[PDB]
């Protein structure tokens, strides 16, 4: 906290010198931001342990300059495909090509692309590779599926706590509760079942005092972190039902309706990263995936959020008001908006957007740093909905 | 001639006089036919219309200056030294200054190597020790500029107000910068100057925007130009995150000026303000415009 | 049959309407005399005022229909429509357990 | 061009060479009493030089010692005035003074590696901040403890919700082998607190001063690194009872090869060690802190941290 | 004059300046116009 | 001229002097107008921005040198011998050396035949016995090189440490190669030298990377350049497999150098470390810069 | 301005009259899109012809009775002359939805 | 694997038939020695006699099959086929009320 | 003669006269041949 | 020199050498990246 008087005294009473000092500090902060923005990504390939144990094993690193092209999308609650093109003389390309016919190797490969020193990470399993010839010049085009595709291959039986070919009662499995807790709990129950149903399920999986401390979760490849049933702050509830439906298909409607986000992170303990907040979070192995349902939009919160605004007075805070039967929700504007700023906004080095206080407005004009491709609006279509069949 | 002087200040701080009084004293002169050097390139946009096409706007393009220099010396070894120094004066990553000085003052353009230089004749250059280097440089910021006008207003009062005289004497709009000390809540002007880019020309004639309340030690720089983020604090705090979608929208239009008001409130120590007004021009020399 | 009326005296909507039968010929050997009679199925009015490509208001007719000569995209879309409707019907005809 | 005006010209300056304008360049008819003066100013207009010409019947000669012009930079703008008797001064030439000489960039510029650094840390904001890199136990092993029960400022320590030991490496490195650390620390309970200097990138090897407090183990050790969470005691311990708000200065002198710790404002080292077998130099100038407690509660923790180059 | 230069290049058609991006976008727009109304709302 | 000497060492080791003192002794001289021979071709990237296009980076391109030689002799038989030898001095698969010697030293470029040579005039070449060959050679590595500097450090102790003096006198960054003997645990420097390509320019100023423990007989080559894999064991063992997502990321930036520390531990029989530092330049000749 | 105007309803109808209204294409606004070609911005507007209303008109088993109470029989069946029966199904559904 | 036999000595249909196993190699580093053995799945004989572009009768083989490397259009078509057949089967297995 | 004119433009390939409409129609026909026999009749 | 020749042909964009098959394959690859992960496995 260098006050103006202190800076002026350090500059010996020269206002111009003091302001040049302040300008130099601002310039160095801007330069740090620009370097962070323009930093090269870190592309690393990992493999399963050949002996069949847990923990991903480091294969190698692809240089950004040594790539031919790359494309990695991050989508909201949707699986995406990452594409990486390499020259066939590249050592990781050679390794990938020899992988199908190498009997000493497991056939699954994981890519991790780190932006901003691992703050942003795109991790995914290998989908395929293709040897493509452009004018007699061969290159390897490698396609990965992002780590949200595991929810397509995770499915919820009617009774996830019992053997499947014996008795699956009732006809469908239904779980009701706070939205984040229920989605995370469905995912966790199916993860438990597919890891083996070895132990007895407590009433609330995310009540960490219910789980024994002697239990070993290191063999799990996927984990789910969530708060307990009572501690969950999800304002709205949800009912999820399944009869051998895939988990993503079960939870898509609830995620859309509650504006929730699934975040996946592959914990590379070889990089020093750790995890907490879920059972067995201390003994997890390298490259284990962790899921978390978050409320990044904060639309259903009590204080509301920003749904609109103008460039001359910023955003406008609105709160959801539910009509008769809670089927319909409208927006009521907070005329006297007095929400406090997040404590993170007062911390040095913070850059993220808090859900309760959105701040990023991207303006397009004659002098704009972005290009706006297309903005499309369309009105609602059907006034009434009919759902049913047999009761 | 003595009416125009052209210099290059390289990335390494070297000084070369390519044209004007004292040109060639460092061994390098400027050959004729230099292009995209005077007027800032602009492309105009047109939409289909009932009477042909309708004007849609203008966009300023980056400068692609192709020019030749001539490096000369009596002996080939000294010519080689001169050629190496000229090569060291240039880079791709960092920009070197190109200063044009006339009776209208000195205006500089920051240029970098767009591609590799093309040196020498068809034979080896040691035969002649007098060889041309063709340079394709580029100006990402295409406007010629002078040193900006800077004003300072410090105060000891908890609440105070001031007026900064401001005037755009150039032919292109300029974007103002502020340096604001902390603690304190600042009200900064964002006058439209009658500009109708947002269809709020005279609606925003006296627009003022309130910066977020700065905590102790959070001295901020508020740059209105679109190249850079608006609010940056010197202590790294995210000041703009607390600035709920607000921004400075209007530049200082050419031919416009006034006493723009700056207000300071809730400043127990009493803060200081600095205003920086750039001097951007689209031409190396031009008479002042009223 | 796909036809494009450029400056022909035919006035779509006035002379012929959607669903109304009309004959057409193709100048190919062996079928010059034959007149293919189909009820008009589609007629599109299109124009482009752009300077690069200016195309005055023109009419394009499609007489008759065929799933064989339908584009693959249109075939897939129509199939998806029918399959979605049939899926809804089957799901609503399901008997509960 | 109705009115007479100056001719834009240039001047040449050389270090170690006498500045001289020959008479055969300033021609003209100069009656007796004519005075010529040359004025050098900077970008702000401040006069950085003024010289008087030797006006003759038909020539003006300028000749100054090199020490007179050694302070005139390249780009400084000059103005030559000729004043006929009983007349106002008339400017003949104006322009810029360029320097034709060997150019020394390294003299003027200072490299970032050639700059003494000084870092501070307060922990008053109740957040770790981006300048501390957790080590030993990985990300999220550090935390801030308020100590609101007593009139004390927040301190930095291990994340006692997960770990009982931790290390933190200051993100940036020093620029000298000699280093001064000033830590104001609090003795909440039993524990061990290491101040670490001359550390490598991963904190594998370092010198350190360890303050240990407990039921009967209040003392100070000199330690060497065996990892961010392991160390080896060097020499004998020195008894020291740490109190809340105690300021300790750990100075490593490179030319003396000596790491010493002073308590408070004492002029005599509380502890001292020399000749430790630890690598020193470039790549071995990182610094940091470490904590180790038996119980899951704060022990000795630093409220205020300060580091500076040199001793 | 016209016969044998740019005026016959115009007769040639899209030999000189012509880009693929807007052509592909226009084809996609035409297909979207054809197929969008018949695509189900589900 | 005596200020510049151009030589070729063929794929077969033949030595030709094309220009300079002793040119034409082997029968082949160099014709004027050779292109892309001096400056390394670099293309600069530009991305849309508020004032046109913003600089986005540079990409160095491979050299495509098109030049011409003249093979001459007094009699057609010996001319045919000379022409055959000149053709034998080149290949497509393997490269040949092209050296330039000046007062700044000797710098070489590795070049290969891009396409078939174009020899002779319109009539049969045995008439004149003095015919030109148009050569289109390419440099996959576009930087002129001098002989890399090699430093050896052998120790008999179990634990030891050394300071390798390293300095980049060229105008482009260079990538270091290490040859480490086994067994032993090696720690090698990966100093950023202020390079901010990973947003850690100051964080990695004194960065050191620890290689995995090497078993007996597992001597490693650790090449930092992107073309080669970082870790290669001479016995084929997957040494990189035990190295936990870690790599050498930083080249030696131009104008930077120091005594980089190399540490060896857990070496029962000592160990040897060899450091190879390339000397890369973008021009055949240039005065040293700093 | 329509999406952000709170005084306007969000549905828009286009009528294109050929030959003085003898031929007419009428439809509801499906969407619009602001599109840029070479920094030049235009608006493309997509309408759905009025036959799309029949997609959103559906026939319950008993159009003459409340839907969530009792819809008997399982399916609704109407037989008659082709034009009359089609028009009658459409009319009964329009009656019910009005 | 996709191959185009331009003037190779291989005779499709005579040397190799549809469904029969053949090996193929690709000149890519790390897999020169490997021979990918797949049963032949497709072979197309195509020719074009047009004056503008002219290709003689040439054969293109596709050995082995993969759902992953299938084109998106073909994947959608196959999925539509399977979905239509399954919808027919479910509808015919419906129990009447 | 041939090297350096239209005879090497032919080696360049589709730089001079070639229209996008026939290429798009041919690609559509290839896709239709590939996918039509496997599309269902419903 | 640059203005009025190939250096402005580059500004023109894909008027001279530019291929249709590679552009079509690139568009198909982008569409495949967009749509492949959401296609069913059946």
């Amino acid at each position: 906290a260098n006050n103006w008087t202190d800076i002026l005294a350090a500059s010996d009473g020269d206002e111009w010198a003091a302001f040049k000092t302040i300008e130099a500090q601002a310039d160095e902060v801007r330069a740090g931001h620009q370097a962070l923005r323009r930093a090269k990504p870190l592309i690393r390939l990992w493999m399963n342990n050949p002996d069949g144990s847990e923990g991903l094993v480091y294969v190698g690193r692809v240089d950004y300059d040594d790539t031919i092209r790359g494309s990695f999308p991050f989508k909201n609650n949707t699986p995406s495909q990452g594409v990486l093109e390499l020259r066939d003389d590249n050592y990781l390309a050679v390794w990938l090509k020899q992988l199908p016919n190498n009997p000493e190797l497991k056939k699954n490969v994981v890519i991790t692309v780190d932006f901003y020193g691992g703050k942003k990470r795109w991790s995914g399993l290998l989908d395929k590779w293709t040897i493509k010839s452009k004018e007699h010049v061969k290159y390897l085009e490698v396609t990965f599926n992002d780590d949200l595709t595991m929810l397509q291959y995770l499915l919820c039986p009617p009774n996830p706590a019992l053997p499947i070919p014996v008795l699956q009662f009732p006809r469908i499995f239904g779980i009701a509760g706070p939205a984040k807790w229920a989605i995370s709990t469905l995912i966790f129950i199916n993860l438990f079942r597919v890891q083996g149903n070895l132990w007895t399920l407590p009433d609330d999986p995310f009540n960490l005092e219910s789980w024994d401390d002697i239990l070993d979760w290191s063999d799990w490849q996927c984990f789910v972190k969530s708060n307990s049933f009572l501690l969950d702050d999800s304002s709205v509830w949800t009912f999820l039902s399944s009869r051998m439906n895939p988990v993503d298909s079960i939870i898509a409607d609830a995620l859309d309706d509650a504006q929730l986000t699934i975040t996946y992170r592959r914990v590379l303990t070889d990089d020093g990263e750790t995890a907490e907040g879920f059972p067995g979070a201390h003994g997890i192995k390298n490259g284990a995936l962790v899921f978390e349902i978050v409320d990044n939009s904060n639309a259903t919160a009590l204080e509301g959020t920003f749904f609109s605004g103008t460039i001359v007075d910023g955003f406008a805070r609105s709160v959801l008001l539910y009509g008769g039967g809670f089927v319909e929700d409208t927006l009521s504007v907070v005329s006297d908006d007095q929400t406090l700023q997040p404590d993170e906004y007062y911390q040095s080095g913070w850059l993220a957007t808090m859900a309760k206080m959105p701040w990023l407005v991207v303006r397009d004009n004659e002098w704009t740093p972005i290009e706006s491709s297309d903005l499309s609006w369309g009105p609602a279509k059907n006034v009434s909905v009919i759902v049913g069949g047999d009761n | 001639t003595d009416f125009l002087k052209i210099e290059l200040i390289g990335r390494d701080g070297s000084h070369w006089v390519l044209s004007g009084p004292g040109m060639g004293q460092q061994g390098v002169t400027l050959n004729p036919n230099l292009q995209q050097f005077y007027d800032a390139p602009v492309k105009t946009l047109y939409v289909p219309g009932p009477f042909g096409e309708e004007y849609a706007g203008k966009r300023v393009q980056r400068r692609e200056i192709v020019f030749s220099v001539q490096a000369y010396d009596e002996d080939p070894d000294t010519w080689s030294t001169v050629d190496s120094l000229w090569r060291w004066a240039w880079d791709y990553d960092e920009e070197s200054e190109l200063r044009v000085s006339t009776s209208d003052g000195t205006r500089f353009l920051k240029v970098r190597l767009m591609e590799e230089p093309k040196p020498y004749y068809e034979k080896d250059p040691h035969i002649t020790a007098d060889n041309p280097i063709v340079m394709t440089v580029t100006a990402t910021f295409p406007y010629w500029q002078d040193e900006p006008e800077e004003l300072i207003w410090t105060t000891l009062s908890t609440e105070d107000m001031t007026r900064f005289p401001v005037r755009n004497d150039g032919d292109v709009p300029v974007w103002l910068k502020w340096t604001l000390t902390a603690p304190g809540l600042w009200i900064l002007p964002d006058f439209s100057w009658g500009n109708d880019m947002y269809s709020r020309g005279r609606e925003d004639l006296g627009r003022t925007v309130a910066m977020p309340e700065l905590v102790a030690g959070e001295h901020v720089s508020v740059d209105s130009d679109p190249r850079v983020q608006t609010l940056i604090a010197v202590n790294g705090m995210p000041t703009q995150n607390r600035w709920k979608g607000n921004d400075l929208l209007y530049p200082l239009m050419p031919g416009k000026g006034a006493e723009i008001p700056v207000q300071l409130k809730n400043a127990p120590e009493g803060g200081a303000c600095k205003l920086t007004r750039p001097r951007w021009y689209s031409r190396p020399w031009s008479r002042p415009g009223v | 049959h796909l036809m494009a009326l450029h400056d022909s005296w035919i006035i779509p909507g006035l002379h012929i309407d959607i669903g109304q039968r009309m004959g057409s010929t193709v100048n190919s050997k062996g079928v010059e005399n034959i007149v293919w009679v189909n009820q008009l199925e589609e007629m599109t009015a299109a124009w482009d005022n752009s300077a690069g490509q200016t195309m005055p208001l023109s009419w394009v007719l499609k007489a008759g229909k065929s799933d064989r000569a339908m584009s693959i995209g249109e075939r897939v879309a129509r199939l998806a429509k029918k399959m979605s409707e049939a899926l809804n019907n089957v799901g609503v005809h399901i008997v509960q357990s | 061009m109705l009115s007479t005006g100056p001719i834009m010209e240039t001047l040449t300056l050389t270090v170690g060479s006498a500045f001289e304008i020959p008479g055969w360049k300033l021609r003209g008819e100069y009656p007796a009493g004519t005075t010529s003066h040359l004025v050098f100013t900077d970008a702000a207009g401040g006069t950085l030089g003024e010289f008087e010409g030797t006006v003759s019947a038909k020539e003006i000669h300028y000749l100054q010692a090199p020490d007179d012009v050694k302070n005139i930079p390249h780009g400084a703008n000059f103005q030559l005035f000729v004043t006929y008797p009983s007349m106002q001064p008339q400017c003949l030439y104006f322009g810029t003074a360029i320097r034709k000489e060997p150019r020394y960039p390294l003299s003027t510029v200072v490299s970032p590696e050639d700059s003494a650094v000084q870092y501070k840390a307060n922990f008053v904001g109740q957040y770790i901040g981006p300048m501390w890199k957790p080590m030993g136990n990985g990300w999220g092993s550090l935390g801030i403890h308020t100590h609101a029960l007593i009139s004390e400022a927040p301190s930095m320590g291990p994340n006692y919700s997960l770990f009982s030991s931790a290390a933190a490496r200051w993100l940036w490195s020093m620029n000298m082998d000699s280093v001064t650390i000033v830590v104001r620390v609090l003795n909440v309970g039993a524990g061990k607190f290491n101040v670490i200097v001359c550390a490598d990138y991963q904190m594998q090897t370092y010198l350190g001063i360890q303050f240990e407090t407990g039921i009967s183990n209040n003392k100070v050790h000199v330690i060497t690194g065996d990892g961010p969470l392991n160390w080896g005691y060097q020499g004998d311990a020195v008894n020291n009872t740490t109190a809340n708000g105690d300021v300790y200065t750990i100075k490593y002198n490179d030319l003396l090869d000596t790491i010493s710790c002073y308590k408070g404002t004492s002029l005599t080292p509380l502890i001292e060690a020399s000749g430790l077998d630890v690598p020193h130099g470039e790549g071995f100038r990182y610094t940091g802190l470490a904590w180790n407690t038996a119980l899951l509660s704060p022990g000795v923790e630093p409220t205020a941290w300060e580091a500076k180059d040199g001793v | 004059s016209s016969g044998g230069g740019p005026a016959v290049v115009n007769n040639y058609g899209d030999i000189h300046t012509a880009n693929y991006d807007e052509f592909y976008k226009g084809q996609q727009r035409r297909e979207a116009q054809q197929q969008a109304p018949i695509l189900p709302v589900r």
Side-chain angles (χ1 to χ4, degrees), chain A residues 15-30:
Chain A
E15 269 89 7
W16 303 93
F19 271 120
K20 267 175 184 99
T21 294
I22 301 184
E23 284 161 33
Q25 301 197 48
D27 283 334
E28 83 189 3
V29 175
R30 295 182 206 274

Side-chain angles (χ1 to χ4, degrees), chain A residues 2 4 7 16 19 22-23 26 30 311-312 314-315 341 345-350 352 359 361 363 366-367, chain B residues 58 150 152 175 197-198 200 207 219 221 226 228-229 232 235-236 238 241-242 244-245 247 249 272 274:
Chain A
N2 294 110
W4 167 247
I7 294 177
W16 303 93
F19 271 120
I22 301 184
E23 284 161 33
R30 295 182 206 274
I311 74 179
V312 300
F315 293 121
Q341 307 275 11
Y345 285 1
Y346 288 108
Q347 304 170 0
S348 173
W350 188 268
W359 69 279
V361 55
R363 314 191 303 104
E366 177 172 354
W367 315 267
Chain B
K58 57 176 300 306
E150 288 172 346
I152 297 189
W175 302 82
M197 77 171 80
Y198 302 125
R200 307 179 56 99
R207 172 167 192 259
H219 317 297
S221 67
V228 176
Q229 188 179 356
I232 288 298
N235 59 321
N241 291 43
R242 289 179 276 125
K244 302 176 297 295
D247 204 1
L249 314 170
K274 182 179 177 179

Side-chain angles (χ1 to χ4, degrees), chain A residues 1-5 7-8 14-30 33 37-38 306 310-317 337 339 341-342 344-354 357-361 363-369, chain B residues 58-60 143 150-152 154 173 175 177 179-183 195 197-198 200 204 207 213 215-217 219-223 226 228-249 251 253 269-274 276:
Chain A
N2 294 110
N3 300 334
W4 167 247
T5 311
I7 294 177
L8 204 46
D14 201 359
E15 269 89 7
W16 303 93
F19 271 120
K20 267 175 184 99
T21 294
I22 301 184
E23 284 161 33
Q25 301 197 48
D27 283 334
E28 83 189 3
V29 175
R30 295 182 206 274
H33 284 156
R37 202 170 65 251
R38 293 170 65 77
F306 300 141
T310 59
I311 74 179
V312 300
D313 64 350
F315 293 121
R317 173 96 54 175
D337 190 25
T339 52
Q341 307 275 11
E344 290 85 15
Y345 285 1
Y346 288 108
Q347 304 170 0
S348 173
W350 188 268
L351 295 167
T353 288
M354 290 318 271
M357 196 75 56
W359 69 279
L360 189 48
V361 55
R363 314 191 303 104
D364 173 31
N365 44 306
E366 177 172 354
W367 315 267
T368 177
Chain B
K58 57 176 300 306
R59 296 293 182 274
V60 59
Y143 292 129
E150 288 172 346
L151 302 158
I152 297 189
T154 176
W175 302 82
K177 201 214 284 169
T179 311
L180 295 174
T181 70
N195 196 11
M197 77 171 80
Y198 302 125
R200 307 179 56 99
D204 283 334
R207 172 167 192 259
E213 172 91 34
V215 300
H219 317 297
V220 296
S221 67
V222 176
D223 204 343
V228 176
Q229 188 179 356
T230 312
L231 282 177
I232 288 298
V234 302
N235 59 321
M237 273 167 68
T239 314
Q240 193 145 335
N241 291 43
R242 289 179 276 125
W243 195 39
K244 302 176 297 295
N246 284 274
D247 204 1
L248 295 174
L249 314 170
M253 273 287 130
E269 286 93 355
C273 181
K274 182 179 177 179
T276 301

Side-chain angles (χ1 to χ4, degrees), chain E residues 12 14-16 18-20 23-24 27-28:
Chain E
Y12 274 95
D14 65 38
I15 63 170
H16 280 171
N19 63 6
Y20 312 151
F23 187 88
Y24 194 84
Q27 290 306 139
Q28 290 326 98

